[PDB]
Amino acid sequence: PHKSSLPEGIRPGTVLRIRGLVPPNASRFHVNLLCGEEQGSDAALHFNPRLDTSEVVFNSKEQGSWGREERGPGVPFQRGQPFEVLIIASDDGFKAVVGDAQYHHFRHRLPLARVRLVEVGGDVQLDSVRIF
Amino acid sequence: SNVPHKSSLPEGIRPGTVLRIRGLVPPNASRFHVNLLCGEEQGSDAALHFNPRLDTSEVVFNSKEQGSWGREERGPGVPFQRGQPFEVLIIASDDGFKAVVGDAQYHHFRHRLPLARVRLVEVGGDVQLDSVRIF
Numbered sequence: 001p002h003k004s005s006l007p008e009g010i011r012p013g014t015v016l017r018i019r020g021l022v023p024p025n026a027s028r029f030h031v032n033l034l035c036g037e038e039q040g041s042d043a044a045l046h047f048n049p050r051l052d053t054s055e056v057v058f059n060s061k062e063q064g065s066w067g068r069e070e071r072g073p074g075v076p077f078q079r080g081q082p083f084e085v086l087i088i089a090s091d092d093g094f095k096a097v098v099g100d101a102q103y104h105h106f107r108h109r110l111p112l113a114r115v116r117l118v119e120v121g122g123d124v125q126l127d128s129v130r131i132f
Numbered sequence: 133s134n135v136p137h138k139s140s141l142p143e144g145i146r147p148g149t150v151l152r153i154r155g156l157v158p159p160n161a162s163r164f165h166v167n168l169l170c171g172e173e174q175g176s177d178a179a180l181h182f183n184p185r186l187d188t189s190e191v192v193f194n195s196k197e198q199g200s201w202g203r204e205e206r207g208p209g210v211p212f213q214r215g216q217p218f219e220v221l222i223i224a225s226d227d228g229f230k231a232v233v234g235d236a237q238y239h240h241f242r243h244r245l246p247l248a249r250v251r252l253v254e255v256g257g258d259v260q261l262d263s264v265r266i267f
C-alpha cells in the first residue's frame with residue numbers, strides 16, 4: 001500500500017500523476033487522498049477502478065462512514081495494460097483524467113486543506129506517483 | 133506540423149486547468165511559442181507568452197497588456213533540443229502558471245493578467261505538434 005505525503009498539501013492547481021500497470025489478474029484497486037496518517041482516516045477522495053464488477057467508484061469517507069458514491073462511465077482500465085491517471089484539484093473538485101481524456105469530476109466534500117497524503121493500494125503495479 | 137494551432141476557451145480558464153502539449157522540435161528549429169491570448173484579434177493581450185528560443189539558448193516567459201510587452205522572465209536553462217520530442221504541462225494555479233518540462237518543475241510565472249480573461253491558446257513557430265490537450 002504505497003503512501004506519500006503532500007508536503008505543501010494540495011490546492012487548486014495541484015496535479016497528481018499516477019503511472020502504473022494493471023496486473024494480468026487484477027480484481028480492483030484504489031487511490032485515496034487521506035487527511036491523516038492514522039489508520040481509518042477521512043478520505044477526501046476514494047477512486048476505485050473495479051475490473052471485476054466493471055465499474056469505477058468515487059467516494060468520500062468521513063468521521064468513519066462512507067458517503068454517496070459516484071460512478072464514472074465505463075472502465076478505462078485494462079488488465080495487463082499500463083495506465084496513466086491525472087488527478088487535478090480545481091477550486092471546486094477533483095478532475096480525474098485517464099490517459100488523454102477527462103474521465104470524471106468529483107466535487108469537494110471535505111476541504112482541500114485537510115488532505116495530507118496519497119495512498120495507492122489494491123491489485124496494481126505502481127511505477128510512480130508525482131505531485132506537480 | 134499542425135501549427136499555428138489555435139484552441140478556443142469560451143468559458144476561459146480557472147485554477148486547476150492543465151495544458152499538455154507534446155511535440156517534436158525539428159532539426160532546424162529557431163524558436164516556437166505557446167500564448168494564452170485574451171482575444172482572437174492580432175496583437176491581443178496575452179496572460180502568458182512561453183517562448184523557447186533554441187537559437188539563443190534561452191526560455192522566455194512574458195505577458196502583453198494593452199498592447200504593451202511586460203518584463204521578460206527567463207527560466208533555468210533550455211530543456212528542449214532540436215530533433216528531440218517533448219512534453220510540456222502548463223498548469224494554472226491560484227497565483228501563477230506552473231511550467232513542467234520533461235517531468236520536472238521548470239518555472240513558476242506569477243499571474244500578471246486576471247485568469248478570467250484568457251480565451252484562446254495558440255501554439256506556433258518552429259515546432260511539429262503531436263497534441264495539445266486542455267484538462
Ligand SMILES: CC(=O)N[C@@H]1[C@@H](O)[C@H](O[C@@H]2O[C@H](CO)[C@H](O)[C@H](O)[C@H]2O)[C@@H](CO)O[C@@H]1O
Nearest residue numbers: 030046048057058059060066067068069070
Ligand atoms: C451498487 C452499490 O451500492 N454498491 C455498493 C459498493 O460500492 C460498496 O462497496 C464498497 O465501496 C467502498 C466505496 O463506496 C469501497 O470501494 C469498498 O472497498 C467497497 O467494499 C458496498 C459496501 O458499502 O455496498 C454496495 O455493495
